[model samples]
Structures are given as structure tokens and as C-alpha cells.
Target: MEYKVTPPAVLREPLVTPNKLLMGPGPSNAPQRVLDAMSRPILGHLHPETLKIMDDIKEGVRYLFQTNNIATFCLSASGHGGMEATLCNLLEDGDVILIGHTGHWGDRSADMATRYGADVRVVKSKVGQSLSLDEIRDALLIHKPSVLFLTQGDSSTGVLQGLEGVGALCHQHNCLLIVDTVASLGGAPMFMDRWEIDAMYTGSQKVLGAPPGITPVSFSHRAVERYKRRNTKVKVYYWDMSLVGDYWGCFGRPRIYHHTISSTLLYGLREAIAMACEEGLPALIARHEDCAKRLYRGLQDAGFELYADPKDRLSTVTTIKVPQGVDWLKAAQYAMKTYLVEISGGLGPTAGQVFRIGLMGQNATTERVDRVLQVFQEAVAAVKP
Candidate 1:
């Protein structure tokens, strides 16, 4: 066959990238060890050795989530894939899904649930605040949704929803609690079993200090039972837990091929988890908390106003209000140009109104946080009068 299309000229050029610091919401720079893991020899998706690695990853995820869930595994997609998988597996036509809307992530979940034919009800909080337990209880009573979706850490607003009693409240109303911990897991303390979270998912890139391809997810026994009782078949084939779980060996059966898993990314994710395990969750969380505290003090000292309420602020991502008369884009650009640092603008309701700085994973260090703070303070001063 005669080739009609030529390879893009850009493909001929060698790849080049500046080593800028990633301090935005997600995709913090991977640690050297994690990158080295990814560089190791690739394995067949289902090789016995690869399966062993998968098992290790599962155990690591369980430790990070503080659960003994059998259905815990990683998805071959970003955090969004985890969200889709959880919703598709648990929701059927006309199922009621109550969403605790804090920011963009909640809005995305609600949209996904609606598309999957669930009756979506949202209990929205103001832009910078988290949903109160009382408000959630009231919504649960009124909607009586089969599932309640919450984002543990909302990157858009940098608000961390309190999950302490929310799960029990859902169970009281016969509701399943699903949480998106994409921006919080590993950086914050999340006790899946103790908190009674039915299903949860997180990203590999954020607090895990890995590349942005894998999504670590877990489902409690209650969530698996919910999936087993679904009336309609899951609409999406790739996201169906029945098949995917089998591939991950979540069930006590022979592993089956579902999709071609990325062994390279899995290696990286495994290494990231191993690092977290070595550090221990308590120390990891304390480090993030301490770094966030440093950042908060620095920002406050610089006369910057944080967007989220003090109690609701997330340790992984911090949102600061764009001071009056300051150009958010210009300040961001200044930081990038002068300091090779990235501080993103807001998303959803907070877009153009705030600056989001992430102190996640390897980036959650006092030195890095201080560097970002310095860049931020100077950038603002340089861009504004």
C-alpha cells in the first residue's frame, strides 16, 4: 500500500523538556527511584513476575488506604479512569447518587453519574468550604441515594472533606460511600476501613510521586456486593469491575486477561508505593502536614489570603486568592520564567480567582515548599504594583 500520510516533522526532532518544578495540583515530579523503576526492563502484562509485582502493588495500596480490602488494585488509566470505574460498577439506571459538591472533582463525578443514568443530587458547599456532616446527613435523608460521592481532597478549591463520620451516616441511610482521593491519598491520613469508605480511588501522580498513568483503587466488601447486585450490565466494558477485578485477581479465582496492563507504569507505581511503605504512612502524612503548615505560614506572612477555610484546607494542594490588582496568569508566568516553578490558576468556580500550589509527594518538602513560596511571593510582587 502506498503511504499517503507522512510522519509529522515534529516526530523527527529529539524530545526536549525543561526541568521545571511541578508545584501545581497534580503530577508532582517523580522521585529518582520511581523513575528508575520505570526505566527497568518491561515485562509482559501477564507474566508471572509481573503478576507478583501486581500483588505487591495491591498490598501497598491496602497499606496506604489502611484497609484489608481484597478488591484493591490499580487501573491502567489516570485518576479520572478510577472515578469512571467506581461509578460504572456501582451505578445502574435510575440509581440515585448523592454528591457532596466541593469543587470541580465533585462536578465531574455528578456529570459522570448522570451520564450513566443515575439520578444525581448534589449538596453543594460554597467554593472554599467543605460539606458539613449535618448537611450531608440532611441530604442523605432527603435523597436516600444508593451511593454518595465525595472528593476527599478537592484540587480546585483545595478543600479536604471530613470523612470521619460521613461513611457511617451513609450506611445509616442505606447509602454506599464512594470517595475520590486523587489529590489527598498518601499526603493526608485516610483510614478506609475505619472511616467506613465503601469505595475509593486515587491517582499515582499526586502524593504517590509516580508518573501520571496508574489509578489505584479499592472497593470494600459492601461495594463489591453492590456491584454484584447491579441490575443492568455496566455500560463501559473497560471499566467493568467484574472483568477488571478478575484481571487484577481481586476475586479468589484464576486471573483472566481483561486489557493489556502497562507493566512499565505498574513498576513505577510499585516503586512509589514501596517508598511510601518504607517511609510509613504516619511519617509521610506528617511530612505533608508540616510542609503545608510551612507554606501556609509563608503565604500568610506574604499577605496572601488562602482560599479554603482553615479547617477545610487540604494538605496536598493549597489555594490562595489572587490578590486584587494582580494578574494571575502574569504571576504564574513570572514564576515559570524566572524560577522554573509551576503554580496553577484555579478551576471550576474558583477559576481566575485563585492560585493553586501543590505540595504533594516528593514536592512536599520544606525546602521545596519554601522555594515555591519564595517564587510565589516574588512573582506576585513583580507582577503587581
Candidate 2:
């Protein structure tokens, strides 16, 4: 029992609300349905009703990932927690893993695997670019890694990586494939089964249009087999799927005490997925496609150079080059404060030379996409012309 220090005044934080338009990369606005769902009464983690809700959420997640994998579950952490779970569960000491590093998320995955003693090998890429399967094939034979890591959408560069044939190659080499679709899953086309991707994870936010905090991961049969064959105990208890699988109601067993269920976030995620289901995944993906095309043409009309190859563009988030002689950060800050418009500065190689705009889930609309473009064009014009 120690004496407490003096309490500070409660008004230390500002009463100001955030500038509204969240065209920046990620943590996009939650839809009204998601918001309403999240405000439902809280329930105890082990409550029978709550666990049943989790089972439904698992089905929703399975539908979104387009997989029938029995090892689908969510962690009570952010999107990166799902990434960490993928890392800790798949890699053992002395194993080798190959990561395609095109932007910040890719580099982070490689670094995390190395921390787990996986002997990480990186296939690096220039920023505003993507890693090719040729690069994967070259790296695979040279490194002969046990697992391959990729990010479907690199939020930092706004690049949507194409996963078409990379899976077959990884499978041929007998390496496990793990993809992070945190920013890509619902916003773009991802056929997990057809693509042969073995394991994948996505967040409740972004494309799902839910409030952030839950990270849902899906694992193929092969990924589950690896866990079943581990020689030693897992490094972490919470990330272990042996327990998470039961909690998801997919392993044909009663739920276990693995981790606390994020009840509210799960509610929001369920509603978001239900919304996606109502619209049909193909239709939702096509909506983002049309908006992204309009966004591309609009920005080009405004004389901005877009990041990523035009043909390989992401359906949701868009990246643009910093125009000549405008202090980019100052412009972004000014736009946010003055116009309630939000855009972001770059990350990784694009740190000072680009800006990113997000068009996730419900935000991927023609009107919404054009609103951000209109403001951005004006902001740029005010700076020079």
C-alpha cells in the first residue's frame, strides 16, 4: 500500500473531435450497422450465448476467406496479433521462412519470424512495387525455406499483391504459405482455396468495416497438420490453435479456456460480414473495382502520378506520388484541420514522396471515393497549381 501521487486535471486531453474524412490508409470509418451491433449489451466471455455467437462468427469468417478450413478463429488482438499468431504457430527453431518484402508489412513479417528463430529469408522489392513469383522461385531454391510469407495488401504502399499462382509454387516446394489480408480480404478478390493459400488472417476493421481489435485467422488442413506434428511445446499458449479451434466450434468439441472472447468486436465483425454476404462477395469486389478505376482516372486528371503498376492496382486503397515542391506533410495536416479531410503521408520507401487513400468496405463507394479526390485535388491546387 503506497501513497498515490497528486491527480492531474481531467481536461488534460483536448475535447476536439477528429477531422471526419478518413481517406488515409486503414482504421476506416465503421458502418452504421457495425456500430449498432457493437453497442449491444456485453456478455461474459464463457457465457453459452457468447460462445454460440463466436461459432456464427467463425462461419462468417470462413465464408469471407472462401475456405472450409476447420481451424478458423480470432485472437483478442489487433491485425498484427493475427500475424504474430501465424508466426509463432508455424515457425519452429531452425526452420527457414521466406518473406516477400514489398512494403512495411512484409518487412515486419520477416522480422517477426526471425525473432522466432525461423532463419528468415527476405525477397526484397522496391517500394511502390510488388514481389514476383520468379523472385519467390529464386528465393525458394536458394534458401529452401519451410514457410512463405506475403501481404495481400501493403497498406504502406497501397499495393495489392497478386496471389494467382504463387500458392501452387509454394505447395510444390513443400513450404507452408501464410498471407496477411488485413487490408485486402473483403476489399478485393481472394479465392483462398483456388489460390492454394494455406493460412491467412484479416482484421475486423478496414474491409470488414468493423471497429478494430479482433484478428481472425484461417488455416488450411496442412497448417493444422504442422501444429499437430510439432516436436516441442508451442512458445505461447494463447496463440495455440489446439485450443482456439475448440473455441471456434469448428473442431467438433466444446469450447475451451484459451483466451477471452472479444464479444463486442465479434458482434461488429459479424454484422460487417453479414453486410458483405447480403451484397455478395463478387458484387462488393466489383464495386470497389469501379470506384478505384474512377479514383485512378480522377487523380490522373488532376495530374498526380499513382503508385503501383496501373494494371496491378489494388481495388481499395490508392497511393499517389507527392507533387513537385509541395511540403506534403504540411499539406495533409492542413487539409485535415481546415477541411475535415484526411489523407496520409508515406511509409517505408515512400516515406516522404507519396500519400495513401483508403477505400475499404463501405467506404469503397463512388461518392465516397470522389469526395476524397475532390478535396485532394483542391488541396494540391492550393499548394501550387
Candidate 3:
């Protein structure tokens, strides 16, 4: 029997794109150019022009990851999908994977790796702090896992993990380092080549200022070799980097039909990458720092305590400790109702204890910081009174 589906009532009307400011942990407001690019004329997924665009974006991803690896490309999936792909591609049954679990991202990564039949060992730290390189070195010396997973910008607690020397340490132990930069890519400093990162993935929605459908991932030469030599078949066919790499021309081979990539989302991602290429990393990172300084000062003046330590704080998302008397949810609601500004609640350890504010891509600016400052002060006052 043939089944038929009906259009929902909500889809019968015209679309309305709201003009709200997204200052939460992700999906910061994209520029007008990026939004316009999404509406551009359609192109076949395997068309020559589309492949060329993908190639151009490959260069962009290389720059974003600060690596010259030929295996760099964007996946038509979310950041979690990127994590799944990385884990499945590298881990076989009984393979040991060490996770430097700091917050929600690390917790989820450990959970995902265990489901992939890997023996996961976690090196954990306090909620607001990051695990140090020396501590990780001790774990590597003991566990000697095949892969070491770390999160660069953990949005849940607004903690930024430093990658300096960690990748080299992983290589010394014959282990691959996979860094999760989903919440910090554009706004934070990352040098994949110099840092010797084996594999890494970041979301388009956060610092890249694109929608949430695309995830940019890269595998270093060593990481690629591991994938090619995997003892077990990749559990998820859609996430097979070997096949997806051929589709993206990563192997200098002829293209093959893998999946129907989203032409619209790719268009928007291309434009977003173009913006990053124009601004360059140094200037973009400096801009984020400026905005963070302004926001921190404003919050201090408002008598709001920040969650993470000063040296450990992330420039992308600033976590504010919720006051004792004021309701955090009510404060968030008042900010949305009165100013259409979005602030997020914490996740995992910081849940219900802090507010996460994202300063990502186009939203990281002195002007925007000033606006957020005003909105936060007024909202807190209303909630407290």
C-alpha cells in the first residue's frame, strides 16, 4: 500500500525569520550575506560547479583548522556527528581511548566512544577548571590508549582547554589527539600543524556563524593513515571518511556519489568561510578578545561573578554564576521578553548554577557587548526585585 503524507498547518503560511539576537552557547546570528547565500539558486550535488565550491571550502577548512592536510572537509552533519565519525573511524573493539573529561562535551565524547566498543578511560577535573597537560601526560604514561580525546572550548562551563604540547605528548605515546572545537573555532586560537593535532572537528553554528547542519572536520596525515588501516569496518557508512573523502576529492581520485549534500547549506557555509578568510584569524581572535574584555568588565560592574577562572575563561562563551536569590530561568525569560536577547543555562556540572553567554563570530563586538551588558543588568534587576 502506498502511504501519503499531508503538509502541516504551520507550513501552509509564509515563513517569518525573527530578528532576535542569539547570545547563547551556539548558532550566533549569521550575517546578511550568509543568510542571502542560503537562498541562492540550487545546484546538483555532483555538479562540477558544486565540486569546485567544495574544493574552495576545503581550503577554507584548512585555514580554519590551521593545517595543510588534504583530508580537511565539511561534513553535512552536526558537531556530534563529527565526534561519532571520528570515534568510529579510529576505534576498533577493545581499543583503549582516553578522554580528558572536563564538562559536557568530554562526558558525551566518552559516552559515545564506549558505545563504539572502545574501552574508555576518563581523566576528569573540577567543573570550572581544565585538566592540565602534565596530568594528561601521567594518564598517557599509564593507560597508553590508542586515542586521546580533548575539548578545546567547552561551552557548558565556559572553560577553554589549552592544546599547547598536548598533541606532541600524544604523538610521543603513539596516540592520536582529537580536539573538539565545536564552540570555539573561529573565535579562539588553534594551530593544528604547529600543535600537531591528529584530528579535530568544529560546528558551523557557533563561531563560524552558519546554521547547525554543517560540521567542519580535519584529519592529519597520521590520523588519515589510522583510518585507512582500521581493522574493523566503520560502523556508520554515512560517516566513512574513506568514502566521504573520495566524494570530497581528498585522495586526488575521481568523485563518487556518496550522499546528497545540501547545496543551500553549503552555499551559506562558503560565505561564512569567505568572511573568515577576509578577516583572517589574528584579527578575528583579537576582536573576540576585545569583546570578552568588555563583557567581563561590564559583568563585574554589575556585581555578577563569572564562573571559570580568569586564566581559564573562554573568549567564545562566558559563564556567569547565578546569584542565590535570583531565579536564573526568570532572568533569561525577562531578557528574552524585554529585549529579545538569548542567554543560555549551563549544562552538566554547571547546570542551574550559571548562565552561558556566547560571543561568537559576527556577534562578538563592542557594540553587541554593550547591548548585552545593558540587557543583563536590566533583566537581573527585574528578576531580583
- The Cα local distance difference test for each model comes to 0.92, 0.84, 0.90
Which one is best on TM-score?
1
User: If both were scored by lDDT, which would come out higher, candidate 2 or candidate 3?
Assistant: 3
Q: Please list all clashing residue pairs in model 1, or write none if there are none.
A: none
Q: Model 1 over residues 243-274: C-alpha lDDT tens digits? A: 87888888988897788899889888999899
**Lowest-lDDT window of 10 residues in candidate 3?**
1-10
What does candidate 2's lDDT look like per residue over 154-208, in tens digits? 8888888888999889889989999999988877889888899888999878878
Cα-based lDDT at residue 96, candidate 2: 89
Clash tally, candidates in order: 0, 0, 0
Better of 1 and 3 by lDDT: 1
Residue 14 of model 3: what lDDT? 95
Question: For residues 140-160, what per-residue lDDT tens digits would candidate 3 score against the true structure?
Answer: 988999899999989998999
